[PDB]
RNA sequence: GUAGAAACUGCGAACGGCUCAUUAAAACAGUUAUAGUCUACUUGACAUUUAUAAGGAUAACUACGGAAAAGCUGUAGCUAAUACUUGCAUUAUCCUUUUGGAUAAGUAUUUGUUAGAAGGAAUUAUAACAAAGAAGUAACACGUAAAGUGUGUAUCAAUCGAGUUUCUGACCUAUCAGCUUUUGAUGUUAGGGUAUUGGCCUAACAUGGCUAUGACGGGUAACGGGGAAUUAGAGUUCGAUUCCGGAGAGGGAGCCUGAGAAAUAGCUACCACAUCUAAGGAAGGCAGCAGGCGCGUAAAUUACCCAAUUCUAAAGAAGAGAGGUAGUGACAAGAAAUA
């Protein structure tokens, strides 16, 4: 048969998941979920080869059974299960939120959060649809399908989504002070406020992105996650700010201790 | 004999209810030490009343001697050695027997055996 | 040249080995399924009416009602025929089978007593066999003991002590679901009923 | 209550592993579309035409056997289930204008007639009318806040993928110059089939399509790719083989099941091999791991373990010749005695 593989080769997992070459051949295969297996990582790894505190799939897995680790306030048991690009993780009898946010390199890191800042989640939305009764339901990037959104919300604008009520508080537009965060691009990592749009005639349509160090760079629009307003993240940045410090002058910082 | 006990990367972990450290002792010009010297010193370092609730391993030598480098964990009881340890590392730290060495030799004998061909 | 002779009634079964071959003359050439009267078998078997249901050949290969032939013969055996064991779910086999006419070369034959005759035999039409394990379901024990929905049957079940667990039970866990599932429904309409009123207001 | 042999039921077994025979615009690689489709598990939304809870139908088992036997098998009796099958309110809309009246009740899918947040273009979403219209909306199981969960179900989106598909790229050969077209070749129409487009196929219609820019043939001791050696740059040769994609399970062909196979440690028939045999009949594919024979210059042990990675499940305690460890191993490679 040629049916869907049910493994994968540790040579072949995704770059980001930094998987030792020697450490057998196999690597864990995310579940099918709410985002896609080259964009988001599983919690095996997360909590094996990122936040170390487990060293083998079998106290991973026990870890795992108690209810104790919650994404967006949902108790999750897929061990392979997939948690994308933005999201909010708990643990609760350490009490401690991550949200997973890129890096300027361009990996993935969990980044310390507050109660209150992890009740604040964003979701860049994909599409909306129309259904039965003229009602119209977005669906967001992290496979989560809000019906009754606010009319002024278009495709490409993010929404503010609440995790209890799962509900939306309040669009953000693509304008040009809208400070986005390239997520696949080649220059993934480094945030900005989008300097223009180039509307190209049914290709895939690219920005120019500025930065605080006036740097200018092109990505496709399929693939930014706006972030926030020209007003300041509203997202907690991790510790390089999302400022592609270049690699030239990354030594000279490197070597000062 | 004397040593000098050095205890790096020292982390909690509630998950485990364990804490996690590298562990490293200096015995220069002496060979390797025995684990319950360790063990004491590391006891009455974390005050620790009891021995059975720590794990060693990893313990390397290194080339001419002077320096052992290892990982140790410490347990918060009984209880949790045994609810979050394995069979092979729990017979290594001596508290329970190994279960039956057959081995492979069960599966060899489950596809000996076939379905119904056998009353039991 | 065995016949196991069954009485569905009495739930009991027994076998007579024979040889002379003038005592089969009455079932040859009669298919499987039909009422012979069964008197040559034995003096006190006259009167006796058996109906011919199973059987097998010399080498072991069984009967098939379907197949109205005197010899083997090999046929693609389907997964709900009744004479295939199921290994693979969808699996089909070719096997050998004997067809339904009876001929001189059965080594073993089984037959139930329809109509009973004159005589009785030791051992088959005097004692009998019961269920050997009671009904299960709460329904099929009500309708055997007549007692409607008056009480709960669990008093009334048959000890050898302990008791078989009685499925379509009345129990409260029941109730309190079924009634969960209502008020979660109606917290449902409710909360949609809201949704679309909180819409309604904001399309302007 | 704790369990629990056997069995029914559910899922997987379509993954993995091995090999490179076939393979020459084919596969593969980069680049597109699917506005021409399907999609297990999972996540997120969510639904329409006896009820203090309905019905049969069966295993294991009991008792008699057959043959030499199969992972073989008959009748009598029975019981269950989340195996199989029936079936129990209410909501929305219009008017005087919180509140009273009246109006109506099909989800997908198909047909006919209209209007018509997005994309790049809709016959799109969706809405209206007239006709049909499946499958469900829990007759099921455990128990968390000092109401919960499992399993199952209609539609949509993503997830894990798959099938088709635009464009660009290949070794030698003209002592291969004209090929294809009744037997579909090239396209039109109509229809069948598929999950969908399509000569995929059928019926009619037209004579078209490719080719010295090498078609059509033939050969390859040719699976393709990133990759390897040699490299100042150019280049030349190799790539079965760590991973990706394709193929195969002795050679063809066919099929059930299943979401997913033209599966092969699934079946069916022939061809070529080959096992037991009481002479009647059964059962087979090590290009999986070890190992033997044959071939050959040439290639390891009929070992141990699921401890590491990862997979399956009814998902901690069970499995995995996957995989790891060890044995042989002057394939290669690195350090380094004989002062």
Known sequence: GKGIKKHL???????????????????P?????????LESIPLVILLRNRLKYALTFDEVKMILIQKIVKVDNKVRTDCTFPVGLMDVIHITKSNEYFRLLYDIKGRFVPHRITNEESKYKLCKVKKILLRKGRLSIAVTHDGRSIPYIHPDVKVNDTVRLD????????????????????????????????????????????????????????????????????????????????????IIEERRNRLKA | DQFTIRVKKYMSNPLLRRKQFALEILHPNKGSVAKKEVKERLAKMYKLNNV????????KTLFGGGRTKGFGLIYKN??????????????????????????????????????????? | MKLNISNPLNNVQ????????????????????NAVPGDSIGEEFTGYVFRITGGNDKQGFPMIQGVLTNNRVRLLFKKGMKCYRPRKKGERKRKSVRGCIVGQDLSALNLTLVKKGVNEIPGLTDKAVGKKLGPKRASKIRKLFNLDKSDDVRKY?????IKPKIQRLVTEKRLLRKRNLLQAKEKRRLEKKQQLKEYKQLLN
């Open chain 1, 9 to 27: 080769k540790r040579v072949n997992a995704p770059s980001h998941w930094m998987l030792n070459k020697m450490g057998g051949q196999y690597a």
């Open chain 2, 52 to 59: 059975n609730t720590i794990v060693l391993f990893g313990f």
């Open chain 1, 163 to 246: 995790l209890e009520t799962g509900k939306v508080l309040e669009h953000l537009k693509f304008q040009v002070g809208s400070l986005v965060m390239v997520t696949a691009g080649h220059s993934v990592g480094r945030v900005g406020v989008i300097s223009s749009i180039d509307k190209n005639m049914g290709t895939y349509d690219i920005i120019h992105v500025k930065d605080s160090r006036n740097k200018v760079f092109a990505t496709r629009l399929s693939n930014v996650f706006v972030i926030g307003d020209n007003t300041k993240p509203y997202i907690s940045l991790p510790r390089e700010k999302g400022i592609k410090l270049d």
């Open chain 3, 14 to 33: 027994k076998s007579i080995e024979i040889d002379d071959e003038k005592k089969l003359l009455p079932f040859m050439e009669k298919r499987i399924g």
């Open chain 2, 78 to 120: 009984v209880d949790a050695v045994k609810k979050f340890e394995k069979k092979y590392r729990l017979v290594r730290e001596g508290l329970i027997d190994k279960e039956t060495k057959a081995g492979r030799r069960a599966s060899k004998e489950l596809k000996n055996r076939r379905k119904k061909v056998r009353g039991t």
């Open chain 3, 157 to 161: 079940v048959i000890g050898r002590f």
């Open chain 1, 29 to 37: 295969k995310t579940s099918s979920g709410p985002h896609k297996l």
